[PDB]
Amino acid sequence: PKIAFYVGLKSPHEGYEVLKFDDVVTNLGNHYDPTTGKFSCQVRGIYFFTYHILMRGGDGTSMWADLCKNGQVRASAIAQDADQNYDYASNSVVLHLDSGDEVYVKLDGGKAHGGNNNKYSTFSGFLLYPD
Amino acid sequence: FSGPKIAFYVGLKSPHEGYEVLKFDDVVTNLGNHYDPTTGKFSCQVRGIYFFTYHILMRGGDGTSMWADLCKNGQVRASAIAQDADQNYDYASNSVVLHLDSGDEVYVKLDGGKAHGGNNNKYSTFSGFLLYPD
Amino acid sequence: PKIAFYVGLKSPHEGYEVLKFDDVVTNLGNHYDPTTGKFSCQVRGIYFFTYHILMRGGDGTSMWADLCKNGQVRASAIAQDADQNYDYASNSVVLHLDSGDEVYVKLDGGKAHGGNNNKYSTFSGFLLYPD
C-alpha cells in the first residue's frame, strides 16, 4: 500500500483544536481530510511525519505547534516572536499507528501564516512499513 | 521501497548564489546519479512519489526578507521566508511530498540572499528520495 | 527489515561528546541505544536521519548541533540566538551506512533542552533501502 500526503494553508488559520491545512498538494490514499485537518490511519504500521509552521501571535509570549496522535502530544515546538523575525515551529516524528488513529497539528498561543502562493506552513507524512 | 533505489543528499563546498537555481556541489549521497551538481537539479527518470527536504543557511539580506523556494519545472511547490539581516544568518527550510513524471526537475532557488556552507561546515542541505514508483 | 527510531529528551542534557536522548518513543529493532546516545547499524544500506535540537548557552557566541557518523560530521547546524530565548539547530541527511556504523547528534557551544513533558529536542531515523 502507498500512503503519503503533503498539505499547506490556503490562508492564515488558527489551530486551537487542530490546524486544518486546506491546500492539498499530495494526498495518496486520500487519508488526510482537510475538513477535519486530520490524517486518519487506515493501514496499521510505522509512519513518518514532519511539520513546519510559520507562527504569528504578537506580544512576547511563547507559542507552540504540536503534533498529536489521538489527543496526545507526540512532538512539540516552541516559537518566540519576537515580532521582528517571526518564528517557525517545526518537528519530525516516527510513530506507530493502528487503524483509526488520528494524527494532526495543533497550535497553542499563536496563528499559522501562509497562503496559496506562499506555501510557508506545511505538514507531510507517509507510511514507512505496514505491520 | 521495493523497486529502483533513488536518493540523494547534497550541500555546499563554499557559499553560492541561487537566483535561478542553487547548485549544491558537495555530493554526499547520489544513489542513481540523478542529481546533477552542474545544473543543481534532480531529474526524475522514475515516475512516482518522492520526498524532498531542504535547509538553507542564508545571509546577505540587507534588512529585507529573503526566500528559499523548492521548485518543480519552474513552479514553486514550497517556500520559506527568512527575515534576519541585522547581523549573521537565518535558515530557510521546508519539506514536500510530490508526484513526478519522468523528466521532471526539482531544485531549490533563492531570492534576496546567498546560501552559506562548505565541506568544513555542512550548513546548507538538500535531500530527497523515491517513496513509491507508479 | 524494519528499522526506524524516534527519540527525545526527558531532561536538559549536555552533548559535547554525544547527546544522549533518553525518551525513546519508537525504536524498531532496538538499534538506538539511550545509554550511548548512538544509533548503531547492523544492516548496511541507505538511511534517512533528521534532528531538531532546542539549545541554550549561547552567550555572545553561536552554538551547534552536528550529526556525526563514526566521529565524522555529516551535517551541521549553527544557532545564534543568545541575548534572549532559545534557538533551534536542525538538519536532515541521507547516508549510506556500513554494518557497525554509529550515528548520533553532537552539541557545541550550548546545552540541549527538554522534558518528557516538553518534547522539544528530537532525533529520528529510518532505513530507506537495505543494500
Q: How far is CA A108 from CA A42, A54, A78, B94, C92, in A?
A: 28, 13, 9, 21, 26
Q: Which residues of A touch B84 (CB under 8 A)?
A: 85
Q: Classify domain B1-134 by CATH architecture.
A: Sandwich (2.60)
The answer to whether the Cβ–Cβ distance between A92 and C54 falls below 8 Å is: no
CB contact under 8 A, C25 and A95: yes
CA C94 to chain centre: 14
Q: Which residues touch A30 (CB under 8 Å, ≥6 apart)?
A: none
Q: Provide the CA C123 distance to its chain's centre, in angstroms.
A: 4
Rounded-to-integer distance, Cα C129 and Cα A127, Å? 14
The contacts of residue B30 (CB under 8 Å, 6+ apart) are: B8, B10
**Residues belonging to chain A with any Cβ–Cβ distance to chain C shorter than 8 Å:** 46, 48, 50, 73-78, 80, 82, 90-96, 128-129
Rounded (10°) CA dihedral C39, C41, C44, C49: 0
Neighbours of chain C (3+ CB pairs under 8 A): A, B
C-alpha B38/C-alpha C96 separation (Å) is 23
The whole-angstrom separation of Cα C43 and Cα B32 is 20
Sheet of A72-79: strand order equals A32-33, A38-40, A102-108, A63-69, A72-79
Please tell me the distance from the alpha carbon of residue A31 to that of residue A40, in angstroms, as a whole number: 6
Contacts of B90 in chain A (CB under 8 A): 85
- Please, are residues B31 and B6 in contact by the beta-carbon 8 Å criterion? yes
Q: What's phi and psi for A105, nearest 5 deg?
A: -100, 140
Which residue from A minimizes the CA distance to B80? Answer: A120
Q: Are A122 and B78 in contact (CB under 8 A)?
A: yes
Give the experimental resolution in Å: 2.4
The full length of chain B comes to: 134
Q: Look at residues B62, B28, B50 and name the one whose alpha carbon lies nearest to residue B106.
A: B50
Q: Which residues contact A26 (CB under 8 A, 6 or more apart)?
A: A4, A5, A6, A7, A124, B49, B96, B97, B98, B99
> How many angstroms separate the CA atoms of A124 and B96, rounded?
7
Cis-peptide into A82, omega within 30 deg? yes
Task: Determine whether the interchain pair B29/C96 forms a contact, defined as Cβ–Cβ distance below 8 Å.
Answer: yes
The domain at C1-131 falls in which architecture? Sandwich (2.60)
CB pairs under 8 A between A and C: 63
Q: Are B96 and B103 in contact, with CB atoms under 8 Å apart?
A: no
Residues of B in contact with C91 (CB under 8 A): 55, 122, 125
Nearest CA in chain C to A62: C85
* Technique that determined the structure: X-ray
The total number of residues written for chain C in this structure: 131
Burial code (b: 16+ CB inside 10 Å, e: under 16) for A38-77 equals bbebebebbbbbbbbbbbebeeeebbbbbbbbeeeebbbb
Q: Which residue of A has its CA nearest to B49?
A: A4
Gap between the Cα atoms of A67 and A51, Å rounded: 8
Q: Is B75 exposed, middle or buried (0-12, 13-18, 19+ CB in 10 A)?
A: exposed
Pairing of strands A72-79, B26-31: unpaired
How crowded is residue B23: how many other Cβ atoms within 10 Å of its Cβ? 19
Say which amino acid occupies B105.
Answer: E
Detail the DSSP E strand segments found in chain B: 7-11, 26-31, 35-36, 41-43, 48-59, 66-72, 75-82, 90-100, 105-111, 114-116, 125-133
